[PDB]
Amino acid sequence: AIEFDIQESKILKGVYIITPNKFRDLRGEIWTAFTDEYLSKLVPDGIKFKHDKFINSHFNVLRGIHGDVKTYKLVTCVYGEVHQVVVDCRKDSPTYLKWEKFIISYKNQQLILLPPNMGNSHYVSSKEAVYYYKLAYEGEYMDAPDQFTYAWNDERIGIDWPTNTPILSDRDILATK
Template identity: 30%
Template sequence: MARFDFVSTPLSGLTLVQRKAIEDQRGFLSRFYCADEFREAGLTKAIKQINQTLTRKKGAVRGMHFQYPPYVEAKLVSCLHGEIFDVAVDLRSNSPTFLHWHGAILSAQNRQSLLIPEGFAHGFQTLTEDCELIYLHTESYHPEAEGALNFADPKLGIVWPLATTEISDRDMNHKLIEQDFQGISL
């Protein structure tokens, strides 16, 4: 019995994952990850790192982060508490949707996750207070391979649902995309 529905988005490879729950009077059980089912959905590499974040303030933005080759990564992003607007940007140089973005609301209540393939940048905005996320990564963090986009870059045109209330100095100061930006070759 499948424990997930995998829903395609307009960006090839970017997948919305609906976790199915078995509920009774005690609460629910929901499978969070299954290597076999996710492999069928396109996640063929093993999970190497799991991160958790807590963002306290509604309207806060984190992102837009990625890693360059040889450390590109796929991520499975889920919201365990609260509600976020999760965004992925296609940075694959050969993609017909290069520099296009897609956003989805992830929450503890809707039990949805975003499966972000290699070659994408990722970020999110909190829609409630005290948002807790968990990320499953197919690659360990390598600071020398880290890249980032500016969350407010007009070339991306991301429409954030709320006014930004908080962002780190680091994320605020990421450069805008330059004319010669080629993206990521996978």
């Protein structure tokens, strides 16, 4: 049986929390992270999920804050634990530059749907983590130089991260200075 509970965020409009059912036993756990039948209605008609991406990171690695005008993202953690933070980067939104954190652990499977013009970021709180995400967009893939970046610790956003000394990419450091 393949079920998804779907709930809009109470605080960031258009952000959805997707909870799959999981079958569990002595062997481990099985779950379906996505079906076209159920979850393709999370994005407008004509836009399809067409990219699957994995990020394997160590403890204390912080990726973000990244977004662009075009790309819907469905994000989760399939091993370990991450603090996922979605930032509202929509200038017309009443919650512009506000954020919401989801602590996603592979034990408690949950996927977050971000529309375009939102900031995606996460911090690895486990020893190791595997972050999975699906990208839906029209046309060509939106490369890093064409995306926007906000500093992880940008004072206008004020994200509560568990550390002051994260391990950062050169991209994510550059947005800091």
